[PDB]
């Protein structure tokens, strides 16, 4: 997952 | 705006293109069209079918709708200051929403509504200006921490407090009058709303400090009302709470407020918990208020390094506001004059000469002997070594997440104010300046490697690599003490410090050199499973180029090499299974009775250690892991087969082999 | 048979429709568009026969001043299909590109709490390397894990 | 053609309703083959509010309208  | 109608010609522009090209500009950048959103589908957008409630404050409430909204309120503020924005949290609740946009109602009768609840709402709101302003002022970061957007909202900034008391005091007047004509279940619920009113007066008193000694009897009120508020908290069942939920409260009104990120469905902590964290609020602002009374300027450093060895990490308006009260402190000049903060640690710690340092006015005497001849290097070491004690401040306001990497940040700094501190000390690793600089340097070492353990980074296979390079630091830090402490120029003031603080070491490393004798044992008792990946040479050498990275780059300590490491448990790991228990359990028994000697030793008639270094419970914590660790280290010794477990107690530094 | 397939531009429309239901993190369209338009041949995708049962999203930069590094973006499989042996021959598929073209790190964020995908990366060799206070918008906490190759 | 008439647009504002009646208003950057009209300084404009948004990207098998002049 990409963090924001 | 848009004037012109061109539908047809869009569809039948964009359909004429290839397979995935884009017509947009020659500086758009994809990379800057990431944080978009893409409006029709949840989690991006919230716009969806919103509907904003029609609210309707024209009904008058009874004694259990305003009881349930005073805790609802209450939980929702709560859970701000605690990461959720202020939309989807706090201007959800139709209340608020309102006067963030005399009584509720149009037509004011004053009804009691207005009386009860509206000096209720009023202070929540101008509780949520001073802590706003508190968020503003720059000592956490805008995303990790809280997110302290204020949606165009107004907090009251200009209403008087002298009104809001007034407004406030009128309504334990008319509650009082009442208390006494109502039943014996109804009375109950009106001094239950009676605590919730003074808890809020009482929260607003520690907000607004206005002195120090209304502020300590006001965070001894909370601590008092919060257990009788959390029992009367079941008084609202089930079919209240639901029918003020969709009377009085929009769950969506983000729909209607500016977006700046999607919707953080960050989840709720209910009523019960949200009271726990006002009396958490409370706990630990009367930690930080006990920095007034820290007579000296080693004893400031200090606070602000066992603040962040709490195992709770108390709250972003409690961290960012121990930057406000340790500057105004009157006994360390800081925030105007800071560098006097560091030559009174350097005075203190290893003494400065009376020809170079004035203690009744803690400056540098301007014309002397080293501060003329060797000019620019004598005004580089002191610029260089105030910019690392006054950074040192601003780090103690940070999540432990990020006080970690901003210590490894600020290692390449020591190290070229500890190179140019012993060029110095010449002109006078031992002197003044060098003693205190690498004392700093082994003290930031020893937190990045036990902040790198409490944040659960390195899996249980590898743990006798880390404990091994925690007491060879701990080993370097404790011979440099010693070395110190037993010199004739230091001031025989501070050399009874560094024998208390030399103490304290050699208690946590012999509850530390305990766990590298007790891993090993169960890494041969299959209690810790060693799997088959990590006797790979060429991971094994990014294990601890990930780890041990900043510690391999300095040249003063030496550091402990993946090749000699391995060294410590191989001469270790030939030790038998019943010669391994009775050998880790005299290094815990000896680091029990050490332990104890030093939380009930004297240790506060000294000037400078730090007399509030007890109440962290660091030291205590480590000695409950040395007790419930050695109970079953005797089960261990009667059957080397017992089915012993490692657990993670969340309220402990260091795990424990407990389970039967 | 399961195979690798390394990512032609007509399996994007189902990349979008898996990668929305588990995973929890809000992408849009043009963040997929943005590490398959500048570096396609470090992602790929596995179909059990022409069906796409999961993919992997990779790019590689020069981070800082010269250290290459690789970073998986996101990584993903259907759930009827998890547990086989897919994505770890798939996620192997990509860090083989970026090993011959000489990176010097690779790196990845997952969830703290997520379990079936941080003791998944400790098996290629990716150890913890930073925390994450509060990282995605849920209030969790993230791993950044790490490989040097 | 296509290209070439979707760049003189490149640059002024849009004004897009999706399909519930919710007009966004915004500067016009970017799309593709389906149509995913990337909107800057992109304004809400619900049943009876506006919000603030600032850059979307609105899909296009939700567009009805794409009137731009101003
Ligand atoms: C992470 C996955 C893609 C991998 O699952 P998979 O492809 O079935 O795995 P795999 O066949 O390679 O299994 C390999 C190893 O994974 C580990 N593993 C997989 N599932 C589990 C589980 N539920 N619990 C523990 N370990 C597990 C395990 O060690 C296994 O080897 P073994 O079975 O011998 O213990 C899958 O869990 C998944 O769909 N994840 C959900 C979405 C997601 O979170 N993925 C990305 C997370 S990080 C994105 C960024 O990056
Ligand atoms: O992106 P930021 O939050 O601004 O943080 C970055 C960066 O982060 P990215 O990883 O997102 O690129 C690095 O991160 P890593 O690859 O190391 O994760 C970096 O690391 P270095 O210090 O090794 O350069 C350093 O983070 P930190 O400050 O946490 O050490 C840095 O932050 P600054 O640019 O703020 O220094």
Redesign the pocket.
Known sequence: ?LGP | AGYVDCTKSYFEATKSLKEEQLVCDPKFTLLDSISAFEIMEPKMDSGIDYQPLRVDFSRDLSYLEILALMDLIVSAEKEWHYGSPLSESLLCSAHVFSICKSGFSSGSGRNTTDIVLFPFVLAVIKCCDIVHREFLMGNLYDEEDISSFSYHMSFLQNYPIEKLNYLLQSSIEYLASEVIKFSAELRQIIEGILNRIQLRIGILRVYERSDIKTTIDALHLIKNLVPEIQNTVSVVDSSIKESILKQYWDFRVQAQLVATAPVRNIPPTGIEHSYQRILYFADDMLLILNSHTLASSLAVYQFCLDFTRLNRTPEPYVRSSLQALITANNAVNLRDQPTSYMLECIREFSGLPSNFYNPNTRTVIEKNSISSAYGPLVESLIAHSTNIMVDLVRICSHNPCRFRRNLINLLPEITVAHFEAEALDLKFSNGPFSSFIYHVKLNAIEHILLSSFEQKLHQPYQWPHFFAVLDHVFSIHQTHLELHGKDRNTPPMAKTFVTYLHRILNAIKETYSGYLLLTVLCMRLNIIKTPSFTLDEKIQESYYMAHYRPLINLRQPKPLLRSEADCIIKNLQNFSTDDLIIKSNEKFTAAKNSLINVIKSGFEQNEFINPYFLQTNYLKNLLCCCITNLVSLAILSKDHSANLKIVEIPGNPLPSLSRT | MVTIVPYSHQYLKDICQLIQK??SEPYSKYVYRYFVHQWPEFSFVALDNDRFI?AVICKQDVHRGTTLRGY?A????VKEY???????KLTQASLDVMKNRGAQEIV???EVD????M??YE?LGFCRYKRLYRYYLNGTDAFRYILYP | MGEILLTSWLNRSVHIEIFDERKFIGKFLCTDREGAAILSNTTEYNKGFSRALGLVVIPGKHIKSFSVRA
Request: glycine share 12%; aromatic share 4%.
């Open positions: 997952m | 588990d995973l999961g998986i996101m990584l993903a499989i998890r547990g086989q042996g897919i994505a770890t990845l964020e997952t997520n379990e079936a995908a003791s998944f098996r």
